[PDB]
Amino acid sequence: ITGDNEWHKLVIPKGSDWQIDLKAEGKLIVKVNSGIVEIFGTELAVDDEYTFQNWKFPIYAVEETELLWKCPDLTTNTITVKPNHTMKYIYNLHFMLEKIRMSNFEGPRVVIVGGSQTGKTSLSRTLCSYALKFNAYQPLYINLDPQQPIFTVPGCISATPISDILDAQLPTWGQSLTSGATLLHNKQPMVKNFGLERINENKDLYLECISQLGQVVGQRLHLDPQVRRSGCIVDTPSISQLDENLAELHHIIEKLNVNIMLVLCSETDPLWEKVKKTFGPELGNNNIFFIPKLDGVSAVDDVYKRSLQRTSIREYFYGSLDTALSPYAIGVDYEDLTIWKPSNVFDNEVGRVELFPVTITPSNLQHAIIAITFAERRADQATVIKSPILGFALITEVNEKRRKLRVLLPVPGRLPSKAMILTSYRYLEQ
Amino acid sequence: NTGISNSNLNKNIQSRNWYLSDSQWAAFKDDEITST
Numbered sequence: 040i041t042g043d044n045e046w047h048k049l050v051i052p053k054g055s056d057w058q059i060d061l062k063a064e065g066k067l068i069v070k071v072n073s074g075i076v077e078i079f080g081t082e083l084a085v086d087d088e089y090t091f092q093n094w095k096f097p098i099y100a101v102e103e104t105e106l107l108w109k110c111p112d113l114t115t116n117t118i119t120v121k122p123n124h125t126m127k128y129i130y131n132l133h134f135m136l137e138k139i140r141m142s143n144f145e146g147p148r149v150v151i152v153g154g155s156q157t158g159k160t161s162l163s164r165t166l167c168s169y170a171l172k173f174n175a176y177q178p179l180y181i182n183l184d185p186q187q188p189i190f191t192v193p194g195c196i197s198a199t200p201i202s203d204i205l206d207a208q209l210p211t212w213g214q215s216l217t218s219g220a221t222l223l224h225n226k227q228p229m230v231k232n233f234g235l236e237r238i239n240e241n242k243d244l245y246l247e248c249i250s251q252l253g254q255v256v257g258q259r260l261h262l263d264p265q266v267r268r269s270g271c272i273v274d275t276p277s278i279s280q281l282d283e284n285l286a287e288l289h290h291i292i293e294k295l296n297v298n299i300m301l302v303l304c305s306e307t308d309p310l311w312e313k314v315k316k317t318f319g320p321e322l323g324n325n326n327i328f329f330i331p332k333l334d335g336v337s338a339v340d341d342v343y344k345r346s347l348q349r350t351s352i353r354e355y356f357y358g359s360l361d362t363a364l365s366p367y368a369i370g371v372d373y374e375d376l377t378i379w380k381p382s383n384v385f386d387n388e389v390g391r392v393e394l395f396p397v398t399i400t401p402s403n404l405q406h407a408i409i410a411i412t413f414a415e416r417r418a419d420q421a422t423v424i425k426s427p428i429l430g431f432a433l434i435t436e437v438n439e440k441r442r443k444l445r446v447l448l449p450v451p452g453r454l455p456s457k458a459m460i461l462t463s464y465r466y467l468e469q
Numbered sequence: 470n471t472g473i474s475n476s477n478l479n480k481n482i483q484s485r486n487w488y489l490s491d492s493q494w495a496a497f498k499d500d501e502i503t504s505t
């Protein structure tokens with residue numbers, strides 16, 4: 040009847056989801072007593088306490104499970120447990136993908152295509168979790184939706200080898216390497232900075248990012264037999280965000296050498312015939328698969344999207360509850376920074392593969408997330424556009440009177456003497 | 470600028486690492502992490 044700070048028993052029948060929506064700011068602690076439960080393919084160890092905060096997700100019962108939960112923002116009669124009838128589609132896909140990893144010369148390079156909240160990211164997470172689960176494969180997870188923070192901050196597209204288990208507690212899947220000892224083995228991602236809020240703000244820049252990611256991805260696959268033998272799992276932005284003719288999907292298929300397509304739509308959805316007609320001559324129809332509506336996949340508003348973007352920025356510098364990190368705050372002079380800004384439809388009408396210089400003012404830089412390239416301060420825009428990303432920094436304060444800035448770094452030490460790119464992303468209170 | 474405390478923000482300290490370059494990342498083997 041009223042939220043408690045005590046533990047409560049929960050029996051999830053086999054094949055059912057415990058659907059969680061952590062609307063409130065409070066934490067949920069879960070401890071499994073017996074059975075098999077999974078958060079997007081990641082099994083929760085028995086007796087180990089798991090902590091969750093501000094995210095929507097299902098705890099799936101592979102086997103009938105008895106667990107204890109502690110959360111003051113939920114009561115025993117406010118719990119949502121519903122049977123799932125869609126997992127069969129996921130397993131069937133996984134075991135066919137797995138058959139390719141064992142028998143074919145190289146692993147499958149799969150694209151997941153579909154509409155807004157069709158279950159694209161949920162499928163990608165489960166396929167990656169399962170790839171690692173049975174015969175230990177290291178697939179490359181490729182995120183092409185910059186609004187979705189996975190292993191990094193929001194301005195990015197990324198490629199990350201799923202070399203060990205994901206963090207079941209995190210909406211971001213897990214985190215990148217740290218300087219010391221951690222409970223989980225963290226990830227080593229390749230990040231390309233788009234920096235703008237939406238794909239439509241540029242497109243040519245978005246497509247250059249894909250071109251650049253595609254290149255390094257090929258180089259890694261050439262040198263890494265284990266990642267080459269496992270495949271790629273490519274997650275794309277919501278289909279509506281891309282052009283009518285789907286020309287951006289041709290660029291992704293070409294650049295990332297895609298050979299399998301998974302389409303998340305309805306049985307009467309025109310998407311099915313559209314995709315078959317365009318990508319069928321290139322991939323072969325046998326290599327295009329239709330996945331119906333996945334059970335439990337819930338709609339996501341822009342307020343929750345912004346909540347995740349905020350969480351991922353703090354997680355970048357400070358880590359998670361179970362893994363506390365020490366970022367470093369420095370005072371910098373106006374003279375010590377070379378910041379560039381990408382071309383965009385708002386500021387430039389068009390949106391071209393071009394960077395413009397940024398003048399150091401509190402209106403331009405306060406609370407801004409900045410991408411640090413590998414390029415030298417003196418490097419020309421052509422070199423900067425093509426330069427890899429070292430990391431991100433947060434500009435907390437900009438003082439006009441004194442001509443100083445306060446910069447938060449993920450790494451303790453000096454401010455890297457490198458060319459930088461201003462992102463559209465902001466974060467208040469370091 | 471002088472809004473709060475510089476420099477290390479919050480025993481056994483640890484920080485986030487910088488990312489690898491294209492060449493270093495391509496040449497990287499996740500078994501470097503995996504063990505242990």
Ligand SMILES: Nc1ncnc2c1ncn2[C@@H]1O[C@H](COP(=O)(O)OP(=O)(O)OP(=O)(O)O)[C@@H](O)[C@H]1O
Pocket residue numbers: 056058059095096097123153154155156157158159160161162184276277334335336337338339
């Ligand atoms: N069975 C389930 N029960 C409850 N919540 C679920 C279930 N499956 C998925 N969700 C939730 O549904 C939401 C949307 O799913 P998902 O992110 O996979 O969709 P999407 O296709 O990637 O969307 P987008 O096009 O915006 O990228 C997520 O918050 C996810 O945790």
Ligand SMILES: [Mg+2]
Pocket residue numbers: 159160184187274275276277
């Ligand atoms: Mg998505």
